[PDB]
Amino acid sequence: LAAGAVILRRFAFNAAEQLIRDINDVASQSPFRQMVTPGGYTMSVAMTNCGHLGWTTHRQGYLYSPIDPQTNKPWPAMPQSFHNLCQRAATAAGYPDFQPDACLINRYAPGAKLSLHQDKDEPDLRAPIVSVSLGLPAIFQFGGLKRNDPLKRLLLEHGDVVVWGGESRLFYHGIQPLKAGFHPLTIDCRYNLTFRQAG
C-alpha cells in the first residue's frame, strides 16, 4: 500500500466466525454505543472496546480509559482469537514485537461512515495499527499527513486486514458511507477491529 503499510486481503477469513462470536461476547458486557464527539455530535458508527485500554470520547477530547464510561465497569478482556489473529497479522506485516493493550470494535450500519482522521491518541508511534474487516464491504480512504493530501480509495472486504505503521502511522484515513447489502456472518453490518498499543 504505502511506506510501512500493507493490505493482507482475506487474511482473517479462517478466524472470522470465531472473531464475530467473540465480538458478541464482548458486546454482552460492554454494549455497542454511538459515542458523542467532544463537539456534541453522535457518531454514525457504533463502538465498544476490549483489552486493558479503550478508546472513548469526552468533553475535553479523545482519550483512552480502562473503564467503560457507560457501564462504569472495566472493558472486557482481549479475547484469545483477537490476540492471536492480531499477532499473526502484525508479524506478517513486518512488526513482530507488536503487543496491543487495546482493541476498538466498530460497527457500521447501512449508511454509516467514519470521516477522515488520524490515529493520534497513542504516545508510542513505533507501534502499528492492525485493522480487521468483517462483513459488508466498505471503501477505505488512505491519504497522507495533510487533509488536502491525495486519497487512495481501496475496497476492504470480509477478512481483509490492513496494517499501517512506521512512515504511514499518522496518515489520514476513513470509511465512506456503507453501501446496503448482506453478508452471511454479520447480517446487515460491517464490523472492524482496530488493535493499538495505547499505553
Ligand SMILES: O=C(O)CCC(=O)C(=O)O
Ligand atoms: O473501520 C475502519 O476500517 C477504520 C476504523 C478506524 O479508522 C478507527 O477505528 O480509528
Ligand SMILES: [Co+2]
Ligand atoms: Co482511525
